[PDB]
Structures are given as C-alpha cells and as structure tokens.
Amino acid sequence: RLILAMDLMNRDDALRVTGEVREYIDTVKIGYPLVLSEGMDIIAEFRKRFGCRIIAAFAVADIPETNEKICRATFKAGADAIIVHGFPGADSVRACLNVAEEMGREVFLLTEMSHPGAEMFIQGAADEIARMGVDLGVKNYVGPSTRPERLSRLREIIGQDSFLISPGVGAQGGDPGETLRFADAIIVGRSIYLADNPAAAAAGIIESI
Amino acid sequence: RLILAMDLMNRDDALRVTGEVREYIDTVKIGYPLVLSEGMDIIAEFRKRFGCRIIAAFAVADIPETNEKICRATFKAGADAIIVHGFPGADSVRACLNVAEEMGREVFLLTEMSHPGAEMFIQGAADEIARMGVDLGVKNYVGPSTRPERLSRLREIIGQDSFLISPGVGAQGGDPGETLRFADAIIVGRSIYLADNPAAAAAGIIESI
Numbered sequence A, B: 001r002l003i004l005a006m007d008l009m010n011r012d013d014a015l016r017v018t019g020e021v022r023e024y025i026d027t028v029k030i031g032y033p034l035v036l037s038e039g040m041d042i043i044a045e046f047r048k049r050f051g052c053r054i055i056a057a058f059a060v061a062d063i064p065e066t067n068e069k070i071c072r073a074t075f076k077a078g079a080d081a082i083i084v085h086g087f088p089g090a091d092s093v094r095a096c097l098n099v100a101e102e103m104g105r106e107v108f109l110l111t112e113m114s115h116p117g118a119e120m121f122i123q124g125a126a127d128e129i130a131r132m133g134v135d136l137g138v139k140n141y142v143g144p145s146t147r148p149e150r151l152s153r154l155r156e157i158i159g160q161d162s163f164l165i166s167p168g169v170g171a172q173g174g175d176p177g178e179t180l181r182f183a184d185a186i187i188v189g190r191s192i193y194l195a196d197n198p199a200a201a202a203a204g205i206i207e208s209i
C-alpha cells in the first residue's frame, strides 16, 4: 500500500534509491522533476530495471487537444497511468480517458490537492470534481493525506470500489495509518528519498501500518 | 522467476487459480484458450484484480499488416507484452515491434518451440531466428525447457542482457532448476492449474529452486 514518489532529479540518485526500496513498494510515481531532467526514456528504464508499475505524475491541466497529445506521449513512453487534474473540466478529463482507452492504460483523477494553497480554490470544487469523475467512469483518484476529513468525503463520493491513492504523507504532515483508513495506498516521496537510509525509512512506514 | 500460464477456459476457474497462486508469481501469461472463451476484456480484469503484468501468448504468425492489427488490439486490451513467432520472417516481426514502440509495450520472440513437433522445422531455423531477433533489436525471447542444450545455445546467441522465458516445465517434461540455468524465468501451466492444490504446487516449484 506504498507508492514511491521519485522526485530526485538525477538518474543515478533516482535509480539508487528506487533499487534500495524496491521490496517495500510495487509502484513508482515519476513526475516532471525527474522526466524534465533525464528525459522520458527514464520511464521505460525504471519499468524494465525494477519491474514496477509507473504512474506519471504530470498533473495534466490543459485543453482537450493538448491533454490528448500529452497522454499519448506519456503512454508511448511506457507509463501505466497518468495523473490528470479535474479542475479544468470534463472535456479535458475525457480527452485523457479517451487516450487511456485507446492505449489500454489508466487515468488517475486529482481531486483535492494536499498543500495549503489547495484550500483557496480547489477544495471548494473538489466534491464536484469527484462527482464529475464518477459520472465520467473514472475509477482511480488522488486525494489529500493532509486532510483526512476531506479524504473521507472523497471516498464517500467515489465509493469503495474505486482506487484512491494519497500524497502528503510524511514531509507535508500526513500520517500513514490515518490516511489508509480511507485511501487504498499512500504516496511517499521525501520521507523516503531524502532519508539517510531510504530502505529503513520505507520499512519503518510499512511497520507503522 | 515463475510465470503462470493460465490456459483454463472459464473465467471463474481462471480467477480462482490465479488468485490462489498470486504470491508466487508476478506475471500471468494469457493466451487464446482463455481469451477466445471469455473475451479480450479478461486481460484488463486480471491486470486490475491481481496487479500482475500480462503477457499475451498469441504466437503471432501472420503477414505484417495483420500482425500490426493483432498487436494493436492486444495492447489496447491492456497486455504488457505479446509473444510473436519469428519463423514467418523479419518483416512480420518488425511489424509487431513497430506497434510495441508506438504503444510503449514489448514483444517476446518465440524462437524454438518446446513440443516434439518443433524438431521438424522450427529447430533447424531457431538459431537464425534468434540471430534475426538480435539484429532487429529484440530484447525478450522464448525458448524450450524441454531442450536445455538448445536453451543454452539460444542464450549464447541473445546474450546475458536479453530476457529469456521458457515454457515446457512440468507437464511437458522440463525441469525448473535446469531450465533456470539458462532462462531468466520459467513458464508453468498445467503443473499448477490442474493440481489439486495450485498454491502448494507453485510453492513446491519455488522451493525446488
């Protein structure tokens, strides 16, 4: 129930840490910090070297036509799933869902974000964003570890059969156990990759739950 | 280093056995016996329910244009890789490789087959089929558990960095340990899925190696 957020920017460090904690995870979330520094080929390299599923954390948030292009390039690169913002609206989300269907991949809908600024505009639209996801047939969602009461409400909207993952554990203040009361899996980045012993940090999280 | 060949024909039995042996495998090989009986949607169902990588054992062996169509449909259905015959020639293999590249997926090249009949025509062409794979950039291969001396020769041609999987273990007479002297992983079907206790059978194989 642990997903590693691999946001280190250099290939050597990213490969080292991911290899050290492989036994504690099954999925690696790779985003722009690593991809823009080392190239999209890093996705296929990780998939091959570690045999883990890869979620591309690209917070897709453009118009439908551009979202389609981003999703196509991302799935061509080997990602198993992509994270898409719901705030830009249904047409933008549908464009991503259409490419995922064409390529046999998945879309994760980012509802409410975990950082403080999410309270300004996203939080007020999050319940409706989750409902839009349900209406569009979305089965995978992202919600905040930092606000378990919001994570509970989002779980209420999407149902027990939807898959919900949650970032904000550790560095941002979220608790593994409390988050897993509602999410199926937790995303952890810095608490593991900036640790003196990433494997010990991962093991500690797994033990705490 | 164990791949389950799930050749049961009904969804209920296939799901039961795969769930029972999940802890001993990481990849499920699904072929036409199950897909033609239950539909291509079974691939996505397995991927979701078990979180395993799926190799579509479709022994692709048609002209380039048709191979492209088969690969596209197979990857759209969610398969992570597809098994392609090398005997029909380089253009037929290249067509599959092109679709795999477009979709961020992989091709496994079937060189020499494991059954007795493979000695009639395939065996005599197998070394050249493997060399053709190397020339085309193929990195994943299938070779016979039933003939470890042939598996050794094929490993010699493709190199240590290529990934080699091998069927024919158990029912067809192949030995897990001897096969793993050359292959990276073994494929096992009947010895596990027809057993009175599939999990015990899988565990026994893992223990024997």
Ligand SMILES: O=C(O)c1cc(=O)[nH]c(=O)n1[C@@H]1O[C@H](COP(=O)(O)O)[C@@H](O)[C@H]1O
Residues within 6 Å of the ligand: A005, A007, A031, A057, A059, A083, A110, A112, A113, A114, A115, A142, A144, A167, A168, A169, A170, A171, A172, A187, A188, A189, A190, A191
């Ligand atoms: O889209 C995301 O992955 C994301 C959404 C969100 O609301 N909050 C959030 O933290 N993330 C990401 O999840 C990861 C969390 O990393 P840490 O705070 O280091 O554990 C980072 O890659 C973030 O960019």
Ligand SMILES: O=C(O)c1cc(=O)[nH]c(=O)n1[C@@H]1O[C@H](COP(=O)(O)O)[C@@H](O)[C@H]1O
Residues within 6 Å of the ligand: B005, B007, B031, B057, B059, B083, B110, B112, B113, B114, B115, B142, B144, B167, B168, B169, B170, B171, B172, B187, B188, B189, B190, B191
């Ligand atoms: O393409 C294959 O997967 C295949 C190639 C080959 O040379 N030999 C071979 O047995 N297979 C398949 O691998 C599986 C082996 O199953 P069992 O003999 O029951 O363990 C079946 O799905 C076969 O169709």
